[PDB]
Structures are given as structure tokens and as C-alpha cells.
Amino acid sequence: YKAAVEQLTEEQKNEFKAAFDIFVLGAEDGSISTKELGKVMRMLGQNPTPEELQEMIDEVDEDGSGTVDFDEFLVMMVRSMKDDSKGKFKRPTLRRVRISADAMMQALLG
Ligand SMILES: [Ca+2]
Questions:
Q1: From ligand 1's centre to the CA of 47, what distance in Å?
Q2: In the 8-state DSSP scheme, what is residue 25?
Q3: Which domain holds residue 98?
Q4: How far, in Å, from the CA of 108 to the mean position of ligand 1?
């Protein structure tokens, strides 16, 4: 979620900006496309196929611009952490309950 991608501290966001900056150092429009993704794969020792690059970008490209921006990159990291929340009960459940009472206070005070 874009809302939960804004529920990350500025220390955490800066650690995701410093990784994304290495991807878009060669980019023109400041967004990760198959050109930057491919050059990064080879730097990591991988040999990706054209299709492999096209599928990885389209999976995390939400706006359909053909590129992955910083807001879209943060959502990928949010999803990586959120999907790894099962099969667990206490930590996920406490986050959802705590968010529920937080929403109830915001409707009253807002
Ligand atoms: Ca995009």
C-alpha cells in the first residue's frame, strides 16, 4: 500500500533510497527500467534474458509507465516484509488491531 509505504521511518526510507540510487545512476528519467535492471543484474554476476527483464519490471510497475519509481520501489519492500508476515499470529494481529484503534481515533479527532 502507498499508505503503508508512508508508515516507514525516514531512516528506513533513506536505506531504500541509497539502494535505488545505484539502480538509477545511469537512468535519465530517474526511474528503474530494463536498461538499468539489466546492467545491475550483470554487475551482480547474473546473465538475464530480455523476457526476464520485462517480467521483473512489469510485476512491480503499478502505474504502467514501463519504469519503477521510488514510490513503486518502496511498495515492493513493503510487500516483501508483509508477505513474510505469515504464517504468524501475534505480530500481524497486534499490528492490525493497533491500526484499527488508530483509525478510530483519527475519525474522532479529524
Ligand atoms: Ca512505474
A1: 24
A2: T
A3: 1-110
A4: 36
Q: Count how many domains the chain has.
A: 1
Length of the chain: 110
- Experimental resolution (Å): 2.2
Known binding-site residues for Ca(2+) equal 61, 63, 65, 67, 72
Q: What are phi and psi of 62, to 5 degrees?
A: -85, -40
Cell triple for 102: 488508530
Residues with CB under 5 A from ligand 1 (ion): 61, 63, 65, 67
Q: How far is the CA of 32 from the centre of ligand 1 (A)?
A: 8
Residue 33 to residue 56: CA distance in whole angstroms: 10
End-to-end CA distance of the chain: 22
Q: How far is the CA of 33 from the centre of ligand 1 (A)?
A: 9
> Do residues 77 and 1 lie in contact, with contact meaning Cβ atoms separated by under 8 Å?
no
CA distance readout (Å), 24 to 29, 42, 57, 101, 109: 9, 15, 14, 39, 41
